[PDB]
Enzyme design. Structure first.
Site, PDB file in Angstrom:
ATOM      1  N   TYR A 102      12.152   5.223  -1.936  1.00  0.00           N
ATOM      2  CA  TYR A 102      11.900   6.205  -3.038  1.00  0.00           C
ATOM      3  C   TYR A 102      10.915   7.036  -2.338  1.00  0.00           C
ATOM      4  CZ  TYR A 102       9.254   2.168  -4.630  1.00  0.00           C
ATOM      5  OH  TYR A 102       8.609   1.048  -4.913  1.00  0.00           O
TER       6      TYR A 102
ATOM      7  N   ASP B 246       2.639 -11.271  -3.505  1.00  0.00           N
ATOM      8  CA  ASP B 246       3.216  -9.795  -3.159  1.00  0.00           C
ATOM      9  C   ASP B 246       2.322  -8.673  -2.173  1.00  0.00           C
ATOM     10  OD1 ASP B 246       5.590  -7.924  -2.700  1.00  0.00           O
ATOM     11  OD2 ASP B 246       4.456  -6.728  -3.991  1.00  0.00           O
TER      12      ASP B 246
ATOM     13  N   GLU C  71       0.513  -0.556   2.958  1.00  0.00           N
ATOM     14  CA  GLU C  71       0.626   0.842   3.018  1.00  0.00           C
ATOM     15  C   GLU C  71      -0.142   1.493   4.038  1.00  0.00           C
ATOM     16  OE1 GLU C  71       1.977   2.534  -0.858  1.00  0.00           O
ATOM     17  OE2 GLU C  71       2.706   0.295  -1.701  1.00  0.00           O
TER      18      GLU C  71
END
Ligand SMILES: CC(=O)N[C@H]1[C@H](O[C@H]2[C@H](O)[C@H]3N=C(C)S[C@H]3O[C@@H]2CO)O[C@H](CO)[C@@H](O)[C@@H]1O
Length: 538
Positions: A367, A288, A292
């Site tokens: 989120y 994964d 960011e």
């Protein structure tokens, strides 16, 4: 007469194909991959003739033999497959073979083939679901959660997940490469120690103690070759062979090295190191990528380039080609996934309609839309829709999904994010029409582990009584609690907003749901992800 019956000598019985050096802090010395475990067995013969050949049997099958030359003997031999074996010493001559009583030996491998299954009862409010919806049900387990949060792999409600993500696997690099880690006491220095003698842009383990050595349930015996989170994940995999366990590379403070991968030399070195990491740690089912974010606006204010979208697509493609190769060598299915910004402004930096061709799933981080990082503009941190007071709200789940769908991403690739934590403010004031979000704040809410952030467990147990107002906004699909006397405001997901998200995923034929982070739930959030996606109880 056949030979006398030998007695196995007392000695070590646990050996490893991948060995962890118990006195090393550099990843390169910590982990020794061999082709086979070096096993040693000794024996004594107390009565009878010692025979002419001595053999070591594993479940009846010879792993070593040699001349039987005295009353005691030692065999040193290689065993290339993990498991727990009923080992015997047999002494043979022309008149027969006489075998010792069996002693169990352990030949450890990182698929957990030497481990009893870690099957633990569900805790707190977690209820059993079958994974039969065909949708993703994912959550993140954090490596450092075994300390203050005291939440270990045996507490994971693993039967209720399809995907378990391990946050985080770091990428080696010092100054200029992992500068965001320096904001966390001791964290940058821990990585440099782990990466000592190891090339920049290769993966490593950030906390080898928590990953491999900390005593945990099922792995507390001192001679257990693997302990800590990894040893327990190996045993979990024995209990849940269809659970996908993915190492997550990156996250908020470990994403800086991605920004350099426009250099194919570094990117090739990274991809090769991921391959080697998966060959070394066989319990993992893919990779994964949690970069960011391409384009910047992550932790590091000095990183981000217009080239990043192209770097991301190339990276996913090369990881896919490496995984297709591993998948061929091993016969296993490997997954490639990525956690991504849900903001349209970050989404439009990447051609996901091209990268989806390399990827199994996209974890949409729907989120952290709002929080104590902005005291002026308040909002729902993880809502499905815009609220009635601001229908043009940029940062919503639906706006992220639609941004991807508009690029031409297939709906089935997209996994919608739920939060198992709230964000909040203190001193909220100057709001109108009884809606605290229309005001401004003076600081972060007192958090469970850090300011501005509260575990869902604590919201449910501490903030749903007394002075706390509770409102479910049915337009946004979003709960919130408010204490007007101190002006404390917390925005979060609850069973109902999660049910809205799950219903939406089914309606829009999306891929499923995932959550950050598993230690923070009391079971309500994960129960609702399972139910709302149509998983059967029981
Ligand atoms: C609130 C919290 O738990 N914060 C964490 C931080 O979590 C980020 C995370 O890195 C980012 N990656 C995902 C995958 S989900 C997403 O959101 C969470 C919460 O905002 O992780 C860092 C390390 O990256 C911790 O220092 C921090 O405790």
């Amino acid at each position: 007469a056949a030979p006398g019956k030998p007695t196995i000598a007392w000695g070590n019985t646990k050996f490893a194909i991948v060995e962890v050096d118990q006195a090393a802090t550099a990843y390169n010395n910590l982990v020794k991959v061999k082709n086979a475990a070096d096993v040693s067995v000794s024996w004594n013969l107390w009565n009878g003739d010692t025979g002419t050949t001595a053999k070591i049997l594993l479940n009846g099958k010879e792993a070593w033999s040699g001349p039987s030359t005295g009353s005691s003997g030692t065999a040193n031999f290689k065993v290339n497959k993990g498991g727990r074996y009923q080992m015997q010493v047999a002494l043979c001559n022309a008149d027969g073979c006489t075998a010792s009583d069996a002693t169990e030996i352990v030949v450890a491998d990182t698929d957990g083939s030497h481990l009893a299954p870690l099957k633990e009862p569900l805790l707190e409010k977690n209820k059993p679901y079958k994974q039969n919806s065909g949708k993703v049900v994912g959550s993140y387990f954090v490596e450092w959660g075994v300390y203050g949060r005291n939440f270990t792999v045996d507490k994971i409600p693993a039967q209720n997940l399809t995907h378990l993500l391990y946050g985080f696997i770091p990428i080696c690099g010092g100054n200029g490469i992992n500068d965001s880690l320096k904001e966390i006491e001791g964290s940058f220095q821990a990585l440099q120690r782990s990466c000592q003698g190891r090339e920049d842009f290769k993966v490593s383990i950030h906390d080898p103690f928590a990953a491999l050595q900390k005593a945990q349930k099922g792995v507390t015996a001192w001679d257990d070759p693997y302990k800590g989170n990894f040893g327990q994940l190996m045993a979990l995999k024995q209990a849940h062979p269809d659970l996908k366990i993915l190492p997550s590379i990156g996250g908020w403070t470990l994403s800086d090295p991605f920004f350099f991968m426009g250099d194919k030399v570094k990117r090739d070195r990274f991809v090769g190191s991921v391959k080697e990491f998966l060959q070394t740690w066989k319990f993992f089912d893919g990779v994964d990528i949690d970069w960011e974010f391409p384009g910047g606006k992550g932790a590091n204010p000095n990183l981000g380039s217009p080239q990043d979208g192209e770097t991301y697509v190339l990276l996913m493609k090369e990881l896919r080609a490496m995984l297709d190769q591993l998948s061929a060598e091993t016969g296993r299915k490997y997954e490639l996934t990525s956690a991504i910004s849900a903001g349209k402004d970050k989404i439009d930096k990447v051609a996901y309609n091209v990268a989806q061709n390399s990827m199994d799933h996209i974890f949409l981080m729907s989120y952290d839309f709002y929080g104590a990082f902005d005291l002026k503009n308040l909002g729902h941190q993880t809502a499905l829709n815009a609220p009635a007071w601001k229908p043009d709200t940029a940062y919503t789940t639906v706006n992220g999904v639609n941004a991807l769908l508009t690029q031409g991403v297939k709906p089935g690739k997209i996994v919608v994010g739920t939060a198992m934590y709230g964000r909040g403010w203190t001193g909220v004031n100057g709001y109108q029409n009884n809606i605290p979000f229309t005001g401004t704040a003076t600081g972060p809410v007192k958090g469970t582990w850090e300011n501005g952030i509260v575990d869902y467990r604590q919201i449910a147990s501490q903030f749903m009584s007394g002075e706390w107002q509770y409102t479910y906004d049915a337009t946004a699909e979003a709960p919130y609690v408010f204490k007007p006397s101190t002006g404390d405001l917390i925005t979060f997901d609850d069973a109902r907003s999660v049910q809205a998200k799950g219903k939406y995923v089914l309606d829009k034929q999306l891929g499923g749901l995932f959550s950050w982070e598993i230690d923070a739930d009391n079971g309500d959030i994960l129960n609702s992800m399972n139910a709302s996606l149509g998983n059967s109880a029981g």
